[PDB]
Design a protein around this ligand. Structure first.
Ligand SMILES: O=c1[nH]c(=O)n([C@@H]2O[C@H](CO)[C@@H](O)[C@H]2O)c(=O)[nH]1
Ligand SMILES: O=c1[nH]c(=O)n([C@@H]2O[C@H](CO)[C@@H](O)[C@H]2O)c(=O)[nH]1
Lengths: 813, 813
């Protein structure tokens, strides 16, 4: 049907049809008479999978022969979503499969919906890893993603009586056609035990062994015939485990619990032993695999060349144990001297920081590490001593600097600061947006920057334009390709060419047409799947992201209520109609976030059923927000809410997705919003509120929320409504915790940005009244979104950190 | 190479080779440069599997169209062994695959050894179920095996310091290419809860739900294009299970533990809750599946026709809960009246008894059933009341009969006798050999036989001649086929034609040649795999079966020591050389059985290293006895030890395997030995010892072991040797428990058969000195082994119990 979806040749369509029928028969053991739609999905997935394997085998053959420097991306999260459409896109197979399935009497889009998300992440950090894998393969890098194969990913969110309920994400129930078990590369991982000292150094003995079994998933590059590997470890008990008899077999579960479930915390540290075990498990298995691959290479014992052949990227501090584990292996097993081992480690490792929120920083109790990983604690103590000796020599007599920079934190319970470990043991430390990287050098890591300034870098985040434009918004990808060709898909900077179409009446009409179609499709999805009705002519106002106080879903709530109250006051006055959509999951133990969800639904209950409002205002909570839902809602959005308190959202990536898909942005000067506004021009963004400097000024004086309550009558009314039980008639005090937080202990200064936010929203409504000028501003956003491709991000990592050159060159097919 | 292995056509070999290469590439994601032997096994298995699916689909299509009466074989054990060679045999593919793999540069026999046994059974009962599935498919019956998919089968046995050690049989580690998950037919199973009474009868409420997910494995008939199904259930927690968050997900393990591990008890009842849950789990899921299939049929609500379309065979009492579960469904859910439901149940169910040992009988505590299955207990009480009302009417005033026949056993703890439940609720009750079925009517079920004589039948056990001749002994199958053709493989009675070859000098030579080749091959296997050396010219004296006091491995031990002591007394006297091989697993909690294993190895330690003995006597313990090992050792055997105390081994099936494979039998008149001797002629068997009647006479008088000790000097010497520490110099009292048992509390009268046993063994040695006459007797055994084909057994079940006609007719290919 459309150009960007590739060719549907007679030869290819015929071959796909017969291979589809082969899999249905031989693989699924079914025929057309008994086959369910799920069977048809699997037949298609196996058919597409077949096209991957030849390229997969020859890519890994190529790496073995050429022996390039290998990039190892270590992450506890890979938020992959669905794989079928992505694979078709990257292989130029979409139209052919569409035709083949059409001729078999099937609707391909219907089959696509059957696939489970691989929801092995929480939000931004996990999705960044997924975008990164796509870009590394597209740029021809010899890259491997290493993580854990969770049996249960992020929970499925159900809303019951307005409250969030969690259920197990049993994503492997029907099987995963994309993965290949590799039980032949199973590796032992050690826990507990004790340290023994001999003539030949230290020995870690009396350990408990858990096996790590790898599962490999292919990662196709965009039309370059490169297929890289994501290798995820699964925990397995050894066969002599605990070996009355029956109980010993049943107790195998204890070891295998390591890879059972993803910790559902977004930007929050929980110091549980099982989490620590997960972190070491991924690190220990991965490092053995890396070293094995290094020794068994065409290069040729000598670890001097280790950093020339290996780069390890730590995604946050979660895999920080890679640093002392590498030291352990090099010193204890390979018998290298400390100084040489340390040189190798530092040159190999690099660390990406994802947040400055104190509650998200990993600080492990010494007593946990003492019991679980006794040798690693000893190594960390030695790292600390040698590091602090360097600090003392650089800043003599500065005793407070010594305590501030220590990897060991003193107190009631001694803790290890994993961020400090990462900085000391890495040759590069990066933040994820310009403002964030500056904040790191000026505030939380100031001491480290003063000691080693060369270590600190910026790498602004990005998103893959394959998943986040071509896949989810084919209508927009096509109208763009009509004007400027297809090269932009792997060179997003080419979107700048669209600036010469801002006055083109044909293009203006097509851009607006694509948005309306997307909105109609999403309005239809909501009715079919959730029996909720919306007006497709209204402004689609959306905030989708994890529920967090710093992200200020509550500020959005205050605006919604302001709009409702203004309508109730002057009912016969015209207002631009809005559909306000808010979605995202709360961590199960995060009480305030659960209360915010309940608030949003409670507002909906009042607003959506008030006859005086009509279809002028609707508030909908988008249930079970996840990658597949993002692919549907983002292309449908008109307004993107990016309203974190300045200085709290390190980068954001949802913001970039909305920009690429034709939504305008209302936001604070926070994270990547700053660079987005810079790229598009401030005139083409809806920027409001305190800057970082204004927040600091308010902190020094002291934030008093009562001041705002006293001086803003519209804000006062809302607080009275919440307190009196207007939004909860049967439980009048339901939201007392929310009011109390807002009035007395609000770390994120919701009230301080309220006035500017509401006024800015008025400007948004004004522009939306003029469709032509709205669309022209939209074109100016899309056209300048090029910087935010993860291809740009990865090229910077490659050149400035990993010391490798990207390549757009095709491998032979 | 050999005729019975089928044709190796140019077309077929070419097609197999290319499909092998396809699977290696697409399925395993490998090439010839990186492939391991395990990869090659899997490529072959997938290639052979492909040939099954077409036949599998059309068989199940055929059953849906013809709607025959369906046979449901319910068992907690299916001792399947390996599947690759069996599938090739039944599909006439062995020579073609042999040729195809040879041309690819691979040895097929080497690849076959890589396959894990499906060890989902303990011994005789589980292996009988496997033979039965093979015969039902071969005889064209619409039959389904239903059981549990254990994650861990029977433990792997390691011998360490002479002691048995157990390790987990992680048979699914590398995957199972033969099974197909069918998550679409997942069914809920209920536990706990309480019974509620309404106007519309009883309701079982507040239950815990566990899901049952089926996995289907194909069961090919011998060259008839029939492929039946074995459906095994796996336990799965529902997604809202226990739904702080992390622990609730981890607690899913509790529900899923139901299908985790096979209880490793052979002929011994252990009253643990997990076992009861397993028993109900298989029954509840299976019955729902049966009823679904019955309702969704081309026949056409009315349960009057249920017994005309359904037969349920209970393999022992393990699935006895089928009786009250069927009543529950019919009465509580379908709203049939009790009397009608009961008629249907009785006409549907039939029960096979496997032993008369009191310790093996299932007697469940009422308090367990009360908590776990409250509705089932109520139904059992009602069944009991109505049954005992019938007894009272038939035998008025006989109050002791009432207590004896009750399903409820009175005492300190009330128990339900599951055997009594089975008899009351089945239209047929059978023993497994003529003597066993007679014992049932005369002793343990005498009261029931008097009430309902028509119910009691015999069905002598059998073995499949596909696995137990063609597969494991191709050399013998071939020399037989040369004379009488190939028809005997599915009509074993044709072996009688071999009686006209007993004086044929060519045949005599070939039979003896096949045995020597088998012995050389097994002697080579022992050296390669266990570094143990044996003399292939010696008599191979073997006892392989589970370790049990009733099976009297201890009597064998006494003979071995007698032979050793006689050699030591007259060293320069000629004795027929023997290799005594004993193998089998002991239940982990069975102390005495573990002591017997240690004794056997301890005798070996003395005998095998005595220079005066030389290579005249060797004692070897065969480690990890299982189906695949049986296939190797049985064709190599000269002498089969079947020496259970008369009246204790219900049938035996190992005995039949040895007879079919050219070993002579030394045994008591017990189980099927009686019918074997009857078939071959007593002159061609080595029968010794007490008959059942002699055992009873000894019991009435009182068994005094001291008498035998006092009157037999050779027996006295052995007991002194055991007591003094001759076989355990460092631990002189190691075997005190064995001696004490033998002298004071021997239920199985080892001493009473000692004299006759030793004398009979002398007669065996005498015959072995004359190779020609040994072989002639062997031919007389093989020729009369026809009755013991499981095809005969299944034909009898079909005609006399299930009311269906067997068919040797081919389905179209
Ligand atoms: O995970 C890995 N998988 C591999 O196949 N290799 C190597 O690639 C070579 C060519 O495919 C193989 O010989 C193997 O050593 C490797 O080092 N790591
Ligand atoms: O386990 C079962 N699998 C099936 O396929 N069937 C039925 O067989 C028919 C023809 O293959 C199907 O329509 C299904 O109803 C069935 O009853 N039980």
């Amino acid at each position: 049907q459309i150009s960007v979806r590739g060719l549907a040749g007679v030869e290819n369509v015929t071959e796909l049809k017969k291979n589809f029928n082969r899999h249905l028969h031989f693989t699924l053991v079914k025929d057309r008479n008994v086959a369910t739609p799920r069977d048809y999905y699997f037949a298609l997935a196996h058919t597409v999978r077949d096209h991957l394997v030849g390229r997969w085998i020859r890519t890994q053959q190529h790496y073995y022969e050429k022996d390039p420097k290998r990039i190892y991306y270590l992450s506890l999260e890979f938020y992959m979503g669905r794989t079928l459409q992505n694979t078709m896109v990257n292989l130029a197979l979409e139209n052919a499969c569409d035709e083949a399935t059409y001729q078999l009497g099937l609707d391909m889009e219907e089959l696509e919906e059957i696939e489970e998300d691989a929801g092995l992440g929480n939000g931004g950090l996990g999705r960044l890893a997924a975008c990164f894998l796509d870009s590394m393969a597209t740029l021809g890098l010899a890259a491997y993603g290493y993580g854990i194969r969770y049996e249960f990913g992020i929970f499925n969110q159900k809303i019951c009586g307005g409250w969030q309920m969690e259920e197990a994400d049993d994503w492997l129930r029907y099987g995963n056609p994309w993965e290949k078990a590799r039980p032949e590369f199973t590796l032992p991982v050690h826990f507990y035990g004790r340290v023994e000292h001999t003539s030949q150094g230290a020995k870690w003995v009396d350990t408990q062994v858990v096996l790590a079994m790898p599962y490999d998933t292919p990662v196709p590059g965009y039309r370059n015939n490169v297929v890289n590997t994501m290798r995820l470890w699964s925990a397995k008990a050894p066969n002599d485990f605990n070996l009355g008899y029956i109980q010993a077999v049943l107790d195998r579960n204890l070891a295998e619990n390591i890879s059972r479930v993803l910790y559902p915390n977004d930007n929050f540290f929980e110091g549980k032993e099982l989490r620590l075990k997960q972190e070491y498990f991924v690190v220990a298995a991965t490092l053995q695999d890396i070293i094995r691959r290094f020794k068994s290479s065409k290069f040729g014992t000598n670890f001097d060349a280790f950093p020339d052949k290996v780069a390890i990227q730590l995604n946050d501090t979660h895999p920080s144990l890679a640093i002392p584990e590498l030291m352990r292996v090099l010193v204890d097993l390979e018998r290298l001297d400390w100084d040489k081992a340390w040189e190798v480690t530092v040159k190999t490792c690099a660390y990406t920081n994802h947040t400055v929120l104190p509650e998200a920083l990993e600080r492990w109790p010494v007593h946990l590490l003492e019991t679980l990983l006794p040798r690693h604690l000893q190594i960390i103590y030695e790292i600390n001593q040698r590091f602090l000796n360097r600090v003392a020599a650089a800043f003599p007599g500065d005793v407070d600097r010594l305590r501030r920079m220590s990897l060991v934190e003193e107190g009631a319970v001694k803790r290890i600061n994993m961020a400090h470990l990462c900085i000391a043991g890495s040759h590069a430390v990066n933040g994820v947006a310009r403002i964030h990287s500056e904040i790191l050098k000026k505030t939380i890591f100031k001491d480290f920057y003063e000691l080693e300034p060369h270590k600190f870098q910026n790498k602004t985040n990005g998103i893959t334009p394959r998943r986040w434009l071509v896949l989810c918004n084919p209508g927009l990808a096509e109208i763009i390709a009509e004007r400027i060709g297809e090269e932009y898909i792997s060179d997003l900077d080419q979107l700048r060419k669209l600036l010469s179409y801002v006055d083109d009446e044909a293009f203006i009409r097509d851009v607006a047409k694509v948005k309306q179609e997307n909105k109609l499709k999403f309005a239809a999805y909501l009715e079919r799947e959730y029996k909720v009705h919306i007006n497709p002519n209204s402004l689609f106002d959306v905030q989708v992201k994890r529920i967090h106080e710093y992200k200020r879903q509550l500020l959005n709530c205050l605006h919604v209520i302001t709009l409702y109250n203004r309508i109730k006051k002057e009912p016969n006055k015209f207002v631009v109609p809005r559909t306000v959509m808010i979605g995202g999951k709360a961590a199960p133990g995060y009480h305030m976030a659960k209360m915010i969800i309940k608030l949003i639904t409670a507002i909906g209950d009042v607003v959506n059923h008030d006859p005086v409002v009509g279809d002028r205002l609707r508030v909908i909570f988008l249930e079970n927000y996840r990658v597949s839902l993002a692919e549907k809602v983002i292309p449908a959005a008109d307004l993107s809410e990016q309203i974190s308190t300045a200085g709290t959202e390190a980068s954001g990536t949802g913001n970039m997705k909305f920009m690429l898909n034709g939504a305008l942005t209302i936001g604070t000067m926070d994270g990547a919003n700053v660079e987005m506004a810079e790229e598009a021009g401030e005139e083409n963004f809806f920027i409001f509120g305190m800057r970082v400097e204004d927040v600091d000024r308010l902190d020094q004086r002291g934030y008093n929320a009562q001041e705002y309550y006293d001086r803003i009558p519209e804000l006062r009314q809302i607080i009275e409504q919440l307190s009196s039980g207007f939004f909860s008639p049967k439980q009048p005090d339901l939201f007392k915790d929310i009011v109390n937080m807002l009035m007395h202990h609000d770390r994120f200064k919701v009230f301080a940005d309220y006035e500017e936010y509401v006024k800015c929203q008025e400007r948004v409504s004004a522009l939306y009244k003029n469709p032509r000028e709205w669309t022209r501003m939209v074109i100016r956003n899309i056209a300048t979104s090029g910087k935010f491709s993860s291809d740009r991000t990865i090229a910077q990592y490659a050149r400035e950190i990993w010391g490798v050159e990207p390549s757009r060159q095709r491998l032979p097919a």
